[PDB]
Amino acid sequence: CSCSPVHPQQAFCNADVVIRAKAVSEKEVDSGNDIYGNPIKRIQYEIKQIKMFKGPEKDIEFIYTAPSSAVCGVSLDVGGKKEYLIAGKAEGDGKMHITLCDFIVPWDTLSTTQKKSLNHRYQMGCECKITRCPMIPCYISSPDECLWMDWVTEKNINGHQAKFFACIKRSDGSCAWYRGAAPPKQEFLDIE
Amino acid sequence: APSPIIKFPGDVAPKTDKELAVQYLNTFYGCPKESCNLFVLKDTLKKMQKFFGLPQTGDLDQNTIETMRKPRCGNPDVANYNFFPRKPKWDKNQITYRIIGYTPDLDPETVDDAFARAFQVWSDVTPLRFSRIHDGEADIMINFGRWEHGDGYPFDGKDGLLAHAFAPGTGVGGDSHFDDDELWTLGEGQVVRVKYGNADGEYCKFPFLFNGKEYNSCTDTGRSDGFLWCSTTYNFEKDGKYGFCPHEALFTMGGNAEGQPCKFPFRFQGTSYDSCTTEGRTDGYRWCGTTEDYDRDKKYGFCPETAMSTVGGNSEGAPCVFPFTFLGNKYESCTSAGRSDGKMWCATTANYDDDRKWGFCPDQGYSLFLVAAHAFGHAMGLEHSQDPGALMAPIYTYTKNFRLSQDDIKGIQELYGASPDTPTLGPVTPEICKQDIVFDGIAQIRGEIFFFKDRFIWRTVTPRDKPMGPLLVATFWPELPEKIDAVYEAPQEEKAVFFAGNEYWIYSASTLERGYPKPLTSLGLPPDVQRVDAAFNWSKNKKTYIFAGDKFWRYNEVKKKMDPGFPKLIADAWNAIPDNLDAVVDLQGGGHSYFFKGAYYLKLENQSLKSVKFGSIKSDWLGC
Ligand SMILES: [Ca+2]
Ligand SMILES: [Zn+2]
Ligand SMILES: [Zn+2]
């Protein structure tokens, strides 16, 4: 499992379904088979979905994940009672796969802003891209591109621009970031 | 265009381009009668450029000649051996000093104090204690003198070398000689301690307003008798306080002459004096006959100071006359016509062509306080520093709120103690790139792009490659505190606005306007005025944006009013812009408004409030 970096917006955009589920009783990874022959191993979670964000209606009842962390370990806890929004690949009837590689975080991690982007925010900037800045110095050409440089500020995924940012789409077809609950304006002016 | 060069009567002004570099490289770099031996040899100008920031190109006649054109100490930068003993340190801790000579530009009380303040600069950081004596030889003989003053090291007329002092030793060891042809002041222009009227004790307040015209030197306007009066505050029409300006031709002090004016000439023992002398005196006090034969009639009074409208030149102080013709054109203001050194003169009759009577319009002068400070260190053994913010730096730089520099504290304490009966100076001079730097303000002031800090500004026009500096911010703006914050200049009136602490300054034409520096309350913002973060103008809206905290502000640079209920947070127009940006700048054309925070900037597009270009401050601007 070698997962590439992305902004928590793309998640809610590239992901089929996003919801906060939890593990009641793990659907003990059962049988399978493959090339070498031997059975396919797959972790399975019994889940309780609070609410759904995006995705198809056939609500998730159990989560599934590749055998070993080595390949993509989304080992999460049961009993405990922590929540996880994890927007894995939606599979028919409550089936959804979580690859360690997927946007997956305990409910408590996200900020007051990150959660509220679930209903409308993030969902407004999908017709938009989110460039990741290689090295100071970096640039953006297209009118729809938004410069994302956490590698610069905070090497890790979780960083200012991810914790509080969302690259919306302008009324001209172009795009740009934000912070707050007020989308309606260009530049502060007065009647002259 | 083909700018005419003239010789003014009294001034001897050849020195063309290099010509000077020749006379000005051996004074502080040892290289006599011969045109420096840089021909088959290469040394001289090099070490000159070592000092003063290393723009080592060679003779660099384009940028370097402007540095030997700045007012400096009379002391050499190299070879400490110039007569003062090898060991530069007083063998004592109780050091006497005596004021032998004074200067007409200042009343002897001001001079007396001016010095004593200088010494204190050193005492406050040393077990050294200076006590003035009025008789016999002391450790420091303080005097003023002109070219050829008696020690073999001549001064050069007005401007140029300001003074000089020998390092600790015998007799001449430690003496401090200040240049008499200079205009000594407390730093900000001519000073005149008023004599009569309703404010007998005060200093003339120049400028001052009377009859709707600003006066910067004593005047006889109003009067009919010819006397000199100056107002004792800015607004005469409101305050009404003033006094008369001292002048031996007008009156005198004490003695037995009852205020009567000097008589010229006046005979004293086979010599006829045409001005006051100190002949016969050791308190260094100018005196004079009030009758034509001092001996016979024995009538006299003192001459504690002389007021003057004009300086230098050949008009003995005569006020300017406007308009005046020179080379065929009339001038109604001081000019630099005929001058190549930029100095500003005017005519003392309506026509220079016919009369050749001129003078210098008095500039800011030099602070006896400061000049003596540096000097005194020399006398305590100290040697010329290479640190722009160091008092013991050769070039003169007027700082209202002067503080010894660590560099100084260091050097002086290194020789002597620190504080009898643990603190330090604090900050040091920031280095270009070497270390991380969060500037106090970046700004487009004129054409140059200044970078700010504690007491320093680096700046440049277009070169991103490498700015210049460091230079004391007080070079251009003295009344500015030792750590400014946001700063901008209104392209609608070309006024340099400086924010700092609870107040703000607004310079225009190298001078702050009456009333400023006001707090930010009367500026526009609420009492939040504790401090600011950044500010600038729009490249398309042409307004001011005062960023402070999580919330930005607005100002009418096109009107006096204010916009409806700000503060509103960045929640509206600004986008990527982070909380509290260190600075904001808009350059010529482009439409980009760079925002500064941390160690990197964020390019903003005015044409479209969105974003762009995230870059490394150090690598992009501020050349590394
Ligand atoms: Ca001089
Ligand atoms: Zn010096
Ligand atoms: Zn001397």
Domains, chain B, ordered by start: 17-193+363-420 (3.40.390.10), 199-251 (2.10.10.10), 257-303 (2.10.10.10), 315-361 (2.10.10.10), 429-624 (2.110.10.10)
Is the torsion defined by CA of B14, B17, B22, B23 positive or negative? positive
Q: Which residues pair with A78 in a beta bridge?
A: A23
Residues A133 and A151 grouped into a single domain: yes
The C-alpha atoms of residue B312 and residue B13 are separated, in whole angstroms, by 14
What one-character-per-residue DSSP string does A133-176 give? Answer: --SSSB---STT---B-HHHH-SSSSSHHHHT---EE-TTS-EE
CA B75 to ligand 2 centroid distance, Å: 5
Inter-CA distances, B8 with A171, A174, B347, Å = 70, 68, 11
Å between A7 CA and nearest CA of chain B? 15
Residue type, B253: M
Name the residue among B451, B440, B370, B434 with its Cα closest to residue B408: B370
Token pair for residue A60?
A: 């998730």
Name the residue among B475, B412, B469, B467 with its Cα closest to residue B71: B475
B321 within 8 A of B335, measured Cβ to Cβ: no
Q: Cite the beta strand spans of B423-578 per DSSP E.
A: 442-444, 449-451, 456-457, 471-472, 487-490, 495-500, 503-508, 511-512, 518-519, 534-537, 544-548, 551-552, 568-569
Instruction: Give chain A's radius of gyration (CA, Å).
Output: 19
Under DSSP, is residue B463 helix (H, G, I), strand (E, B) or coil? coil
Task: Report the first-to-last Cα separation within chain B, whole angstroms.
Answer: 39
Resolution of this deposited model, Å = 3.1
The domain that holds A75 is classified in CATH as: 2.40.50.120
Cα angle B420-B424-B427, degrees, rounded to a multiple of 5: 160
The C-alpha atoms of residue A50 and residue A20 are separated, in whole angstroms, by 6
Residues 6 or more apart in contact with residue B178 via CB below 8 angstroms: B103, B142, B143, B144, B145, B162, B163, B184, B368, B371, B372, B375
Considering only CB atoms, B571 lies closest to which of A152, A177, A182, namely A182
B100 within 8 A of B180, measured Cβ to Cβ: no
Entry field: residues in chain B: 624
B177 within 8 A of B151, measured Cβ to Cβ: yes
Under DSSP, is residue B360 helix (H, G, I), strand (E, B) or coil? strand
Token pair for residue B622?
A: 């501020």
Name the residue among B171, B155, B188 with its Cα closest to residue B71: B155
B422 within 8 A of B586, measured Cβ to Cβ: no
The C-alpha atoms of residue B61 and residue B21 are separated, in whole angstroms, by 9
B574 within 8 A of B552, measured Cβ to Cβ: yes
Question: Which strand (E) or helix (H) includes residue B483?
Answer: none
Å between A12 CA and nearest CA of chain B? 21
Residue in B closest to A181 by C-alpha: B571
Residues A37 and A71 grouped into a single domain: yes
Stretch 53-112 of chain A: residues touching chain B, C-beta under 8 Å: none
Token pair for residue B223?
A: 């009067």
Per-residue buried b or exposed e for B459-494, using 16+ beta carbons within 10 Å of the residue's own CB: bbeeeeeebbbbbbbbebbbebbbebbbbbbbeeee
Strand B176-179 relative to strand B141-145: parallel, antiparallel, unpaired? parallel
Which residues from chain A sit within 8 angstroms of residue B578, using beta carbons?
160
Q: Which residues pair with B335 in a beta bridge?
A: B345
Which residues from chain A sit within 8 angstroms of residue B616, using beta carbons?
136-137
A96 within 8 A of A60, measured Cβ to Cβ: yes
Name the residue among B586, B577, B581 with its Cα closest to residue B443: B586
Residues A139 and A58 grouped into a single domain: no
The C-alpha atoms of residue B513 and residue B504 are separated, in whole angstroms, by 12
Under DSSP, is residue B214 helix (H, G, I), strand (E, B) or coil? strand
Is A62 a domain residue?
yes
Name the residue among B614, B610, B593 with its Cα closest to residue A142: B610
Residue in B closest to A142 by C-alpha: B612
Q: Count of A–B CB contacts within 8 Å?
A: 66
Name the residue among B3, B9, B2 with its Cα closest to residue B337: B3
Is A191 a domain residue?
no
The C-alpha atoms of residue B84 and residue B162 are separated, in whole angstroms, by 19
B225 within 8 A of B287, measured Cβ to Cβ: no
Q: Which residues pair with B210 in a beta bridge?
A: B213
Question: B541 vs A187: CB contact, 8 Å cut-off?
Answer: yes
Is A192 a domain residue?
no
Report yes or no: B573 at the A interface, CB cutoff 8 Å: yes
Neighbouring CB atoms inside 10 A of B374's CB total 27
Under DSSP, is residue B238 helix (H, G, I), strand (E, B) or coil? helix
The C-alpha atoms of residue B174 and residue B167 are separated, in whole angstroms, by 5
Which residues from chain A sit within 8 angstroms of residue B613, using beta carbons?
137-140, 147
The C-alpha atoms of residue B20 and residue B82 are separated, in whole angstroms, by 22
- Can you list the pairs that A166-171 forms with residues at least 24 positions away whose Cβ atoms lie under 8 Å? A166/A9, A166/A117, A166/A121, A166/A122, A166/A124, A166/A125, A167/A7, A167/A9, A167/A125, A167/A128, A167/A129, A167/A130, A168/A121, A168/A124, A168/A125, A168/A128, A169/A124, A169/A125, A169/A127, A169/A128, A169/A144, A170/A143, A170/B610
Which residues from chain B sit within 8 angstroms of residue A113, using beta carbons?
none
B317 within 8 A of B281, measured Cβ to Cβ: no
What range does the domain containing A116 cover?
A: 1-14+111-182
Which amino acids of A are annotated as binding site, given as ranges? 1
B485 within 8 A of B440, measured Cβ to Cβ: yes
Identify the domain boundary among A67, A95, A110: A110
Is A88 a domain residue?
yes
Residue B565 φ/ψ, nearest 5 degrees: 15, 75
Stretch 136-155 of chain A: residues touching chain B, C-beta under 8 Å: 136-140, 143, 146-147, 149, 152-153
Residues A88 and A133 grouped into a single domain: no
Residues A25 and A93 grouped into a single domain: yes
DSSP state at residue B256 = T
Question: A152 vs B554: CB contact, 8 Å cut-off?
Answer: no
Maximum separation of any 2 CA atoms in chain A, in Å: 78
DSSP state at residue B198 = G
Residue type, A138: C
Q: Give the 3-state secondary structure of B365-428.
A: CEEHHHHHHHHHHHHHCCCCCCCCCCCCCCECCCCCCCCCCHHHHHHHHHHCCCCCCCCCCCCC
Residue B362 φ/ψ, nearest 5 degrees: -65, 125
Considering only CB atoms, B576 lies closest to which of A133, A136, A177, namely A177
Å between B563 CA and nearest CA of chain A? 7
Under DSSP, is residue B352 helix (H, G, I), strand (E, B) or coil? helix
Entry field: residues in chain A: 192
Neighbouring CB atoms inside 10 A of B251's CB total 21
Neighbouring CB atoms inside 10 A of B552's CB total 25
Identify the domain boundary among A55, A86, A110: A110
Cα angle A154-A160-A162, degrees, rounded to a multiple of 5: 100
Which residues from chain B sit within 8 angstroms of residue A152, using beta carbons?
600, 614
Residues with CB under 5 A from ligand 1 (ion): B 160-161, 179
Instruction: Mutate one of A187, A189, A191, A192 to test the B interface: name it (highest B CB count within 10 A).
Output: A187
Question: B541 vs A147: CB contact, 8 Å cut-off?
Answer: no
Which amino acids of A are annotated as binding site for Zn(2+), given as ranges? 1
Instruction: Mutate one of A7, A121, A142, A147 to test the B interface: name it (highest B CB count within 10 A).
Output: A147
Which residues from chain A sit within 8 angstroms of residue B614, using beta carbons?
133, 136-138, 147, 149, 152
Token pair for residue B210?
A: 């009377």
Q: CA B98: distance to chain centroid?
A: 26
Q: Which residues pair with B185 in a beta bridge?
A: B367
Report yes or no: A191 at the B interface, CB cutoff 8 Å: no
Token pair for residue B297?
A: 């009639």
Name the residue among B190, B233, B178 with its Cα closest to residue B210: B233
Residues A23 and A105 grouped into a single domain: yes
The domain that holds A168 is classified in CATH as: 3.90.370.10
Domain count, chain A: 2
Å between B448 CA and nearest CA of chain A? 24
Question: Which strand (E) or helix (H) includes residue B593?
Answer: strand B593-597
Is A96 a domain residue?
yes
- Breaks following residues of chain B (C-to-N distance > 2.5 Å): 421
**HSE-up of residue B25 (Cα within 13 Å, Cβ side):** 24
Å between A174 CA and nearest CA of chain B? 9
State yes or no: cis peptide before B265, omega within 30 of 0. yes
The C-alpha atoms of residue B300 and residue B277 are separated, in whole angstroms, by 12
Token pair for residue B438?
A: 């969060």
Inter-CA distances, B394 with A127, B277, B570, Å = 64, 32, 48
CA B158 to ligand 1 centroid distance, Å: 4
Is A69 a domain residue?
yes
Token pair for residue A159?
A: 């960083």
- Kindly compute the dihedral angle of the four CA atoms of residues B121, B126, B129, B130, in this order, to the nearest 10 degrees: -30
Identify the domain boundary among A110, A133, A148: A110
Q: Which residues pair with B129 in a beta bridge?
A: B94
Report yes or no: B620 at the A interface, CB cutoff 8 Å: yes
Residue type, B530: Q
Which residues from chain B sit within 8 angstroms of residue A138, using beta carbons?
613-615
Residue holding tokens 């700048």? B585
Strand B518-519 relative to strand B503-508: parallel, antiparallel, unpaired? antiparallel
Residues A57 and A79 grouped into a single domain: yes
Neighbouring CB atoms inside 10 A of A90's CB total 19
Residues A141 and A165 grouped into a single domain: yes
DSSP state at residue B614 = E
Of the bound ligands, which one is closest to the alpha carbon of residue B145? 3
Residues A30 and A95 grouped into a single domain: yes
Residues 6 or more apart in contact with residue B220 via CB below 8 angstroms: B226, B227, B228, B229
Is A187 a domain residue?
no
Name the residue among B310, B330, B325, B285 with its Cα closest to residue B100: B285
What one-character-per-residue DSSP string does A42-97 give? Answer: -EEEEB----EEES-SS---EEEE-S-HHHH-----BSS---B---PEEETTTEEE
Question: B611 vs A180: CB contact, 8 Å cut-off?
Answer: no
Residue holding tokens 């659907």? A27
Residues A105 and A35 grouped into a single domain: yes
Is A188 a domain residue?
no
Residues A73 and A142 grouped into a single domain: no
Q: Which residues pair with B584 in a beta bridge?
A: B595
Neighbouring CB atoms inside 10 A of B272's CB total 13
State yes or no: cis peptide before B154, omega within 30 of 0. no
Burial group, residue A99, by CB count within 10 angstroms (0-12, 13-18, 19+): middle
Question: B613 vs A138: CB contact, 8 Å cut-off?
Answer: yes
Strand A95-97 relative to strand A62-65: parallel, antiparallel, unpaired? parallel
Burial group, residue A161, by CB count within 10 angstroms (0-12, 13-18, 19+): buried
State yes or no: cis peptide before B85, omega within 30 of 0. no
Residues A57 and A34 grouped into a single domain: yes
Residues 6 or more apart in contact with residue A185 via CB below 8 angstroms: B572, B573
Question: Which strand (E) or helix (H) includes residue A17?
Answer: strand A17-19
Considering only CB atoms, A188 lies closest to which of B554, B576, B578, namely B554
Q: Give the 3-state secondary structure of B89-118.
A: CCCCCEEEEEECCCCCCCCHHHHHHHHHHH
The C-alpha atoms of residue B597 and residue B121 are separated, in whole angstroms, by 38
Q: Which residues pair with B165 in a beta bridge?
A: B176
B128 within 8 A of B398, measured Cβ to Cβ: no
Is the torsion defined by CA of B425, B428, B429, B430 positive or negative? negative
Cα angle B209-B224-B213, degrees, rounded to a multiple of 5: 15
Name the residue among B587, B496, B581 with its Cα closest to residue B540: B587
Considering only CB atoms, A136 lies closest to which of B568, B600, B611, namely B600
